[PDB]
């Protein structure tokens, strides 16, 4: 991450978060030190690994992602404003997650761990990817959190007091969690 001529060799992604059950890592911007890669300037790659029986909370990214299964098996969940489409991913499965649809991702019953690769095609903010999470956690909170008392009053038709007890929080081991069942 910083000033190399023409190096077409990468081995270090920066970590977004990591913990007892998993990790989300993100590669340095391709067009980084070399100018030898302005044609990749828009693409980004994230690696991902969760221990058995874990969860990636619901979230949506601004970038179109092409998900690909390197190791494990997963239960992917694509949520849209009318229902869901759910899928059991296997070593070698590749799925395409459009921008902005929220999705949660789970490693099942296992011993076998989950390693997924995410190739991201960015637009909004060239070579910049951003995910948004519903739930509050210590990394950051809910985007919902960002609104106004009334904004949440009117929208919701529930006093703020009851908006925040399903708003702000202590989900600790953050964005990757251990599942109950």
């Amino acid at each position: 991450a910083q000033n190399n001529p023409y190096l077409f060799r990468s081995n270090k992604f920066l970590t977004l978060f990591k913990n007892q059950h998993g990790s989300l890592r993100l590669l340095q911007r391709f067009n980084e030190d070399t100018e030898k890669l302005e044609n990749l300037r828009d693409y980004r790659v994230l690696e991902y690994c969760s221990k058995p029986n874990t969860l990636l909370l619901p979230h949506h990214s601004d970038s179109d992602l092409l998900v690909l299964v390197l190791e494990g098996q997963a239960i992917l969940v694509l949520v849209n404003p009318d229902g869901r489409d759910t899928y059991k991913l296997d070593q070698g499965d590749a799925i395409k997650i459009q921008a902005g649809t929220p999705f949660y991702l789970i490693n099942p019953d296992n011993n076998q761990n989950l390693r997924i690769l995410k190739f991201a095609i960015t637009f909004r903010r060239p070579g910049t990817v951003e995910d948004f999470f519903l739930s509050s956690t210590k990394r950051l909170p809910s985007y919902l959190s960002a609104f106004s008392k009334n904004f949440l009053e009117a929208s919701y038709d529930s006093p703020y007091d009851e908006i925040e007890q399903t708003l702000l929080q202590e989900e600790q081991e953050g964005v990757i969690v251990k599942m109950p069942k």
């Binding site: 920066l14 977004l16 978060f17 993100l26 969860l55 909370l57 619901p58 949506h60 990214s61 601004d62 969940v77 949520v79 849209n80 404003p81 009318d82 229902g83 869901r84 459009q98 921008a99 902005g100 649809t101 929220p102 949660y104 637009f123 909004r124 903010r125 070579g127 990817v129 951003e130 948004f132 519903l134 739930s135 509050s136 210590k138 990394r139 950051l140 909170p141 985007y143 919902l144 960002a146 609104f147 106004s148 008392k149 009334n150 904004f151 009117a154 929208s155 919701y156 038709d157 529930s158 007890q165 399903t166 708003l167 702000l168 929080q169 989900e171 969690v177 599942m179 109950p180 069942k181």
Partner: protein, 184 residues
């Protein structure tokens, strides 16, 4: 608008995509109009009454610029800033709120949740760029609510409460898209 019709012959309205009471929204997309079809724009007309919150949402692909034709608006935009940053918690969470008004322009990125407030009777024009494929996902309201889709077991895991407790909080608002802004 002549019967020798056929060009870049002018365009205007159809059934609003979200009419209601509290307010309405008309919207010409690119997939249903050719002069924008190759233009990639989305054009949309937003009309609302004194006090009708446009409820938290975010467009998937489109980046919409909005101008205040007539009225007074309270916009509240929400953000996570630059990923020439490289650190989760190390990011930002920002709320950009402006009371716009006849004259002003608000830019509205593609995934960033937004909510409006019609302080005066409102007329707004939307010029959406990066059109082909846009979806509007809602985080409040009765139709197209998405917080309303995360299954039960997950909601428990996701929001500071629970499966049953989300499902309520959620429909404690029997209204669509534009609702009552009436504070207390």
């Amino acid at each position: 608008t002549l019967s020798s019709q056929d060009k870049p012959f002018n365009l205007r309205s159809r059934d609003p995509i979200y009419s209601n009471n509290y307010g309405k929204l008309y919207e010409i997309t690119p997939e249903k109009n050719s002069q924008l079809r190759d233009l990639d724009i989305l054009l949309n007309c937003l009309q609302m009454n004194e006090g009708a919150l446009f409820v938290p949402h975010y467009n998937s692909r489109a980046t919409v610029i909005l101008v205040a034709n007539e009225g007074r608006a309270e916009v509240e935009l929400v953000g996570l800033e630059q990923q020439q940053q490289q650190g989760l918690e190390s990011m930002q969470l920002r709320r950009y709120a402006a009371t716009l008004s006849e004259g002003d322009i608000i830019v509205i990125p593609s995934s960033f949740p937004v909510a409006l407030k019609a302080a005066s009777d409102l007329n707004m024009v939307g010029i959406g760029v990066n059109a082909e494929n846009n979806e509007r996902n809602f985080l409040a309201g009765h139709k197209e609510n998405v917080i309303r889709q995360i299954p039960r077991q997950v909601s428990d895991l996701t929001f500071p409460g629970s499966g049953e407790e989300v499902e309520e909080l959620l429909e404690n608002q029997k209204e669509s898209y534009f609702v009552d802004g009436q504070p207390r």
